[PDB]
A paper describes a structure:
In this study, the effect of physical and chemical factors on the orientations of macromolecules was investigated through an analysis of selected well studied macromolecules, and important parameters that determine the behaviour of proteins on cryo-EM grids were revealed. The test proteins used in the analysis include human C-reactive protein (CRP) pentamer, CRP decamer, human erythrocyte catalase, SARS-CoV-2 spike protein, E. coli PaaZ and E. coli β-galactosidase. We performed a comprehensive examination of how macromolecule orientations respond to alterations in physical factors, such as freezing temperature, and chemical factors, such as the addition of surfactants or the presence of affinity tags, during grid freezing for a standard set of proteins. Hence, electrostatic interactions at the AWI are an important factor in determining protein orientations in the absence of any additive.
The SARS-CoV-2 spike protein is now a well studied trimeric viral membrane protein whose symmetry can vary depending on the conformation of the receptor-binding domain. The spike trimer has three receptor-binding domains (RBDs), one per monomer, and they can adopt different conformational states and thus dictate the symmetry of the protein. Soluble spike protein shows a preference for a bottom view on grids in the absence of an additive. In this data set, we observed that there was heterogeneity in the RBD domain, and hence C1 symmetry was applied for the rest of the analysis. Subsequently, CTAB was added to the sample, imaging was performed on thin ice and side-tilted views were obtained, which resulted in a reasonable isotropic map. The final reconstruction was obtained with 261 703 particles to an overall resolution of 3 Å. At this resolution, amino-acid side chains and glycosylation on the protein surface were visible in the ordered regions, but the regions of the RBD were poorly resolved, as substantiated by the local resolution plot. Other parameters that might affect the orientation distribution include the glow-discharge settings for grids that change the hydrophilicity of the grid surface, the grid type (for example Quantifoil with carbon support or Ultrafoil with gold support), the grid hole diameter (0.6/1, 1.2/1.3 or 2/2), the freezing temperature and the blotting duration. In our case, removal of the affinity tag and addition of CTAB to the sample buffer were required to sample other views of the spike protein, which resulted in a map of reasonable resolution and improved isotropy.
Author numbering:
A (entry chain A): 27 to 71, 84 to 135, 157 to 177, 185 to 245, 257 to 624, 632 to 677, 685 to 825, 845 to 1136
B (entry chain B): 727 to 825, 845 to 1065
C (entry chain C): 969 to 1017
D (entry chain B): 193 to 245, 257 to 289
Write the structure that this text describes.
């Protein structure tokens, strides 16, 4: 029988309290929605692999315990749990399967404690684990109405007991205990744990309230990657997919003869060290088991090649040098090691790749009278360079005189052989050493291991091996022309791109198996739970071959684009304004096709229209809108200060004195951060402190109907900010700060407090509304707000009469615009995106920096006190120096990212200062600089680490068609508009301004004469009044 | 904009080794910060393109009767004959810039995400801006596009630089011929020399050189036995295989960090260029600028955007 | 490393241990050069602005 | 090309039929490797050997060059043959 585990198999990962924190764990869990076994235990009158989840609804315990082990036949020590009315008994002994076992010849562990078990059948969930010889039990008890097996619900299993057993467990069994042996029935549930990454949500009480299975579906994958239970609408790049290989292919040359390395191992006479013999061994097979199957060795020693692994490599060529060495000199053959025989007899290069085998030879080499046959020379002109021979038995002038002829005074030929004896050799007895020295994976291999070749496959990615070169990918017919000596083909990236078949001499191209980006396109998690998956730059004919989540791989909705293959969205022909960009002009949305679904489509670039251009047709606006739009600009960022000493190593004197040598690095870091902080203060000063004096609004706030109450400060509030300023302050959300402070990362307060920043803003507001642009240049000169507005109108080419003749309408439009700003700021939280994401970037940078302290950087731990406690002084120092280099690199990375962020913030602050100079302190002509439309004025508003400009703009509306002429010919002479344009309603012609329909009689004042009407193209006929 | 790049730690640093993956997952913080920075850069490239080009609410179309008082915009307006709805000058610019090593880059985990806007839709945005400029003038930048004869728009642009509008109407044919001959000279200069599109070409070359240097860093040993992990795993048991692997990981992670930092600085300079391009589209294309030597040398009259590979070309028309 | 001067490292060490010190020294100095060049790139960006 | 490093003697060779123009034309071609031998012997001087078919009088000619530790740049064609060097 089988069933589905919805949300069972969750337990507290460790005995640690938390609160209101989403924690990501990687451990053995029962996967969500898993195929769990429904076991039924009946009497007639299981492998324990990677943890086990056991669920029992049963009462009147028929399961009276469990059994655990590897063999359960007393060959290995077994574990048993047994339960009765009052308590439980745990026994770990040599149990031979109390009818359950016969005798306990060897007992090591016993345990007695309180019992672990506490139609209304109730669940007693247990988790059984064994890690590093520690056997852990987790449990939880829940009452259920017994609707059915494993209902819907969430609960964790709190830990009860852990036992340091330290025995092998592979298989486990459940007892069937009887009080006769009457027939009975039972039922319980078995689940198998797997290494999975889970996300746990902690309540205020620290109880694990909910969990997310990161590796079950794309939606939960995005949830785990963002470390949140809610995912905002968009597209998120999740873990990359890789098409797994099918099988393994091994191609070695068909060589079957054996390498006689055993011959040099049992040679009758070994050549002496001065005349040691080497020969090439090749074109055969090699093994490291027969060398000790014939005779046990004494010393195995090699660099860069593990003794076990050499069976899986193929060798280009190998040399075996066998010779007799004195028992005490066994460590003289090491690279770099010098001595008498090293310098005068034989030595090997420092970069030596090979393995050494030494064994005793006293019983074959030592003689009762002394074996004076193994000669060695201690006399030479100078040192012997590696892999060279000296066999000249000529007299060496050891003394000050040129000792020539047969011999000389204190001058000796090669030294007399040792008198080696069987019994006198107590540690000095002769030994035989054999060095195998080789280079591999440079030339075509001839000598291989016992491993046999396999069949060749093509157009299917596999674990290919060629003479020890092992890789993974597809093989293809080669169009390249190799040469007889050539065996490998490399690319720019120093990686194999073509290989030669060792058995068929054929050349094959190599291409790693297809892979690419995996992105998850989701609407709001609240809105829906169905998602789309994009495989980036992957052919849609290949992912069906890739049929870990395979639920969506069923297809039937697959859409191909340049960006890649999209699964789980339906392509539609019509075009909408696009919210989630896929790439290459494809956008995904979630709407009704009446059911809701995710769709993909070609994005529209807005509404299609054709402007009615003609010979003589102009469109003149008859109305306007005073549109007030908010522009948010970051100005400063959180001034951060960091001290090396506390962060890199708090309260550690040894670490402090090892770090003081990096004083230059630390001073550079402090200088950079201090520069950044002073630059933040300078940014704020440049943006806000553009006024010599603090101006004050008059108590009589009468500005010809313009209502500035929402932007002017309210004296009632202690911090003298405005309504809009208060809303902006509340919108941005500014504990982890305590941990940041305690790890040596401090936040310096800004020089200007929010109160004085608000006072600067209020002074700018008062200056703007009472003086206009004059206070920017020199002394503030008072002017009625109506006339300042008339001037701003005159600035955008609109005659000032328009504003005075529509003063009330413009005032009402401005007031309603401010009302709409208030409503938009109060309703949606997406208004102050830029300031919020700047704060989020700073917070994320500091959180990443504080998380870097958990990084070990190749140390035994991350905490320095444990390093000192668990290591000797030298090892402690050689770990802590690497740890300090790592943490200093993390600090340097943080400071560099902060420098780049501060550069972008300085760019934004320079732009904000320019906007305060050109939009607030004056009227700008730069198109789309101070808001969309014809800029009239701007109002600064302080915001957390930024400014908000209320760009007031004139936007024409209610346009009308008119017939127009480039000039008028009245008395044979062309007439041109002084400042305006000629338009005709159909019968009469009029001169009008360009941004507001107002016709005027064509007279001599508004027109000027130039030449005659025979040269101008499109001139018309009319009359001009004197 | 620049080529939106994406990097996978597992593919680049570790290739396809399980043991390398387990030794690397401890440095997950570093990899997540690198991916976050690169994703920020790519979204910033899309935002740069949107800010520069997508400044217009509606896609305008030029009327079939292309009569603009002798100004013939055939070389800059899109040609329906060609499948790619670009112009003659746009086609020349596309051909001039040149975009195997890309296959090796892809196989080493360094991928190029396609831009959100295709060259076709970028050309359509440019064509909409062209149609708005030649049929409405500066009005379509402010609010609703208001049609106006090109002659009158030219008279207005003349009035902007302190030249009385009578000058243009009394010399309409001469100015139209001068403009046509100027466009001819632009076509000849673009067709003849390959040094015209220096900036876009060197930007592409900088990106290609950065990726080539990154892929070449894989040959560096970083004090290990070898620069290939697979032979290290094959020839070594865990206890020193892992210390060689972790040195290799530290080296390659430092190379990736260096690449990402250089990309952040390059993206900052590209963002500066894109902000300047958006300002030039706002002040030169969507209106007449008074800033001296901003929209070309002389008294600026108007500008015409032209899409180009990862960039824009302004045909600054100036009175000299 | 043992010291900050290469000449004494060469004088007092046989090639292998000399090179295993020198490579660490080169990595340190190359990191210092990279830091200098990165700071110069940021300074040059601000100077270009 | 004859080399000996750490007691290993390597031979490189190539055959190029040439016209009757003059000694050492502008012709370029690389020498493919033939064999390496484990000589393990100190080598300072070499001399070549001549055959005679007597001792008939005759004339011959060869060319000797000395190798140095140098840095070269090699250009590979589509066939992988070293086409040019710098
Ligand atoms: C608007 O301006 C266009 C650019 O000057 C112009 O296009 C040019 O038109 C002529 C035809 O009058 C073409 O001349 C060619 O004609 C054939 C077919 O292509 C060729 O075999 C000839 O060799 C000759 O070169 C030009 O190719 C064409 N383009 C260019 C770049 O000159 C229009 O004619 C103008 N139209 C109006 C109404 O003003
Ligand atoms: C200005 O008029 C144009 C078209 O001119 C019209 O021509 C005659 C048919 C007659 O009706 C005249 O009085 C008109 O002036 C308008 O352009 C069209 O607008 C409609 C929407 O009403 C649209 O469906 C068409 O596609 C447009 N035609 C073209 C060629 O673009 C235009 O809307 C008028 N402007 C205003 C502000 O109303
Ligand atoms: C956290 O635990 C506390 C303590 O048990 C809970 O407080 C109790 O809540 C219940 C239900 O509202 C009340 O009947 C009790 O009177 C409360 N006791 C006390 C001492 O306050 C609290 O509800 C728990 N919170 C959560 C979210 O689980
Ligand atoms: C210009 O547009 C405004 C609205 O933007 C018009 O004002 C409206 O006028 C009508 C009729 O008098 C009133 O019912 C509305 O209440 C007004 N709206 C507002 C917001 O006050 C104005 O009439 C238009 N101008 C002209 C000349 O028609
Ligand atoms: C400016 O607008 C505000 C809000 O629209 C007005 O404030 C209201 O004023 C009335 C009368 O003084 C009070 O009864 C309300 O409680 C106020 N509401 C708020 C939200 O403050 C203010 O009166 C307007 N100013 C002028 C001069 O009309
Ligand atoms: C075009 O505008 C003119 C100017 O007002 C209009 O002419 C007037 O029309 C009214 C109503 O018929 C007469 O009372 C005036 O005497 C006319 N004045 C002049 C100077 O002619 C004309 O009606 C308008 N036509 C249209 C179609 O709008
Ligand atoms: C505008 O009026 C003038 C004179 O009232 C017209 O000029 C005459 O045009 C006719 C036909 O082209 C010629 O034969 C006459 O010699 C012209 N007279 C003068 C004094 O120049 C002119 O044609 C009218 N405009 C239009 C468009 O018809
Ligand atoms: C690379 O090698 C191939 C084969 O040796 C050459 O291909 C020959 O090229 C000549 C000249 O173009 C043709 O006449 C032959 O028909 C080709 N033979 C084959 C089998 O393809 C090729 O030319 C070489 N590359 C170069 C640059 O010379
Ligand atoms: C952040 C956000 O947009 N949330 C909304 C949510 O409030 C609303 O209930 C739902 C259905 O309209 O759509 C979504
Ligand atoms: C569980 O797996 C077994 C063996 O493949 C299968 O017979 C059974 O149908 C599965 N049950 C579920 C619910 O998947
Ligand atoms: C339970 O078993 C243990 C050990 O076998 C024993 O000491 C105890 O007396 C038993 N209790 C009952 C109630 O059976
Ligand atoms: C493999 O065996 C065949 C038949 O004996 C032989 O022709 C071939 O040469 C062998 N392979 C190699 C690489 O020599
Ligand atoms: C996918 O492969 C097929 C080969 O059958 C090819 O025709 C097609 O063009 C490929 N897809 C894309 C998007 O290039
Ligand atoms: C879109 O239209 C084409 C014809 O131009 C048609 O083949 C296709 O089926 C349509 N798309 C869908 C999703 O039906
Ligand atoms: C456009 O204007 C010119 C100049 O008057 C005229 O010659 C031409 O006929 C006009 N075209 C149309 C279609 O009215
Ligand atoms: C090799 O021979 C030369 C020639 O005399 C000699 O100087 C040199 O010392 C020899 N090499 C060694 C290692 O002795």
């Amino acid at each position: 029988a089988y069933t589905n585990s919805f949300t069972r198999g969750v337990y507290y990962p460790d005995k640690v309290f938390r609160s209101s924190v989403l924690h990501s764990t990687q451990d053995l869990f029962l996967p969500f929605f898993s195929n769990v076994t429904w076991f039924h235990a009946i009497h007639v009158s299981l492998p324990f692999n990677d943890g086990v989840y056991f669920a029992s609804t049963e009462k009147s315990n028929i399961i009276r315990g469990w059994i655990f082990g590897t063999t359960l036949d007393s060959k290995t020590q077994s574990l048993l749990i047994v339960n009765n009315a009052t308590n439980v008994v745990i026994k770990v002994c040599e149990f031979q399967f109390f009818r359950v076992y016969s005798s306990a010849n060897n007992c090591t562990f016993e345990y007695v404690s309180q019992p672990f078990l506490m139609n209304f059948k109730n669940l007693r969930e247990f988790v059984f684990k064994n890690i590093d010889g520690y056997f852990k039990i987790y449990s939880k008890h829940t009452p259920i109405n017994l609707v059915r097996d494993l209902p819907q619900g969430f609960s964790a299993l709190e830990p009860l007991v852990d036992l340091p057993i330290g025995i092998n467990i592979t298989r486990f069994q459940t007892l069937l205990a009887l009080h006769g042996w009457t027939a009975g029935a039972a039922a319980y549930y078995v689940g198998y744990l797997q290494p999975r990454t889970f996300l746990l949500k902690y309540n205020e009480n620290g109880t694990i309230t909910d969990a997310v299975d990161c590796a079950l579906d794309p939606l939960s994958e995005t949830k785990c990657t963002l470390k949140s239970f809610t995912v905002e609408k968009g597209i998120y790049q999740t873990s990359n997919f890789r098409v797994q290989p099918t099988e393994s292919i091994v191609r070695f040359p068909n060589i079957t003869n054996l390498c006689p390395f055993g011959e040099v191992f049992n040679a009758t006479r070994f050549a002496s060290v001065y005349a040691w013999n080497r020969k090439r061994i090749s074109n055969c097979v090699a093994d490291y088991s027969v060398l000790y199957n014939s005779a046990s060795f004494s010393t195995f020693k090699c660099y860069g090649v593990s003794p076990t692994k050499l069976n899986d490599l193929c060798f280009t060529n190998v040399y075996a040098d066998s010779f007799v060495i004195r028992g005490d000199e066994v460590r003289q053959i090491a690279p770099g090691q010098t001595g008498k025989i090293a310098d005068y007899n034989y030595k090997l290069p420092d970069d030596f790749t090979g393995c050494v085998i030494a064994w005793n030879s006293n019983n074959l080499d030592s003689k009762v009278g002394g074996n004076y046959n193994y000669l060695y020379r201690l006399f030479r002109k100078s040192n012997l360079k590696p892999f060279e021979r000296d066999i000249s038995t000529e007299i060496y002038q050891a003394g000050s005189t040129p000792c020539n002829g047969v011999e000389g005074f204190n001058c000796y030929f090669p030294l007399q052989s040792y008198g080696f004896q069987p019994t006198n050799g107590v540690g000095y007895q002769p030994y035989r050493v054999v060095v195998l020295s080789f280079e591999l994976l440079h030339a075509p291999a001839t000598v291989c291991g016992p491993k046999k070749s396999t069949n060749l496959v093509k157009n299917k990615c596999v674990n290919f091996n060629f003479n020890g070169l092992t890789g993974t990918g597809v093989l293809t017919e080669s169009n390249k022309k190799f040469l007889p000596f050539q065996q490998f083909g490399r690319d720019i990236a120093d990686t194999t791109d073509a290989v030669r078949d060792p058995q068929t001499l054929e050349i094959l191209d190599i291409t790693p198996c297809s892979f690419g980006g995996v992105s998850v396109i989701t609407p709001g998690t609240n809105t829906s739970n169905q998602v789309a998956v994009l495989y980036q730059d992957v052919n849609c004919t290949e992912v069906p071959v890739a049929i870990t989540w395979r639920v969506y791989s069923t297809g039937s909705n697959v859409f191909q684009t340049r960006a890649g293959c999209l699964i789980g969205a339906e392509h539609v022909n019509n075009s909408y304004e696009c919210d989630i960009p896929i790439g290459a002009g494809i956008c995904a949305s979630y709407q009704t096709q009446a059911s809701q679904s995710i769709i993909a489509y070609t994005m529209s670039l807005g509404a299609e229209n054709s402007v009615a251009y003609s010979n003589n047709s102009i469109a003149i606006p008859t109305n306007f809108t005073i549109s007030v739009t908010t522009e948010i600009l970051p100005v400063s960022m959180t001034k951060t200060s960091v001290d090396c000493t506390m962060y890199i190593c708090g309260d550690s004197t040894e670490c402090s004195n090892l770090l003081l040598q990096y004083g230059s690095f630390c001073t550079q870091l402090n200088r950079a951060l201090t520069g950044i902080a002073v630059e933040q203060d300078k940014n704020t000063q440049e943006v806000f402190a553009q006024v010599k004096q603090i101006y004050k609004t008059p108590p009589i706030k009468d500005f010809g109907g313009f209502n500035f109450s929402q932007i002017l400060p309210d004296p009632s509030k202690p911090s003298k900010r405005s309504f809009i300023e208060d809303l902006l302050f509340n919108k941005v959300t500014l504990d982890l700060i305590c941990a940041q402070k305690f790890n040596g990362l401090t936040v310096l307060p800004p020089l200007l407090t929010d109160e004085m920043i608000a006072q600067y803003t209020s002074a700018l507001l008062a200056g703007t509304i009472t003086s206009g642009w004059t206070f920017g240049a020199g002394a503030a000169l008072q002017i009625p707000f109506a006339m300042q507005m008339a001037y701003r109108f005159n600035g955008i080419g609109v005659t000032q009469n328009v504003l005075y003749e529509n003063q009330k309408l413009i005032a009402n439009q401005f007031n309603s615009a401010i009302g709409k700003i208030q409503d938009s700021l109060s309703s949606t939280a997406s208004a102050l995106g830029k300031l919020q994401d700047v704060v989020n970037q700073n917070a994320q940078a500091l959180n990443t920096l504080v998380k870097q302290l958990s990084s070990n950087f190749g140390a035994i731990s991350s905490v320095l006190n444990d390093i000192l406690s668990r290591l000797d002084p030298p090892e402690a120092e050689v770990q802590i120096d690497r740890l300090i280099t790592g943490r200093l690199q993390s600090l340097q990375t943080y400071v560099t990212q902060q420098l780049i962020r501060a550069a972008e913030i300085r760019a934004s602050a320079n732009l904000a200062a320019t906007k305060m100079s050109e939009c607030v302190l004056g009227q700008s002509k730069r198109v789309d600089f101070c808001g969309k439309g014809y800029h009239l004025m701007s109002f600064p508003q302080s915001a957390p680490h930024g400014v908000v400009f209320l760009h007031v703009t004139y936007v024409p509306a209610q346009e009308k068609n008119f017939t127009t002429a480039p000039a008028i010919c009245h008395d044979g002479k062309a007439h041109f508009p002084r400042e305006g344009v000629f338009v005709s309603n159909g019968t009469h012609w009029f001169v009008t301004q360009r941004n507001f329909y107002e016709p005027q009689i064509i007279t001599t004042d508004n027109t000027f004469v130039s030449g005659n009407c025979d040269v101008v193209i499109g001139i018309v006929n009319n009359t001009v009044y004197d």
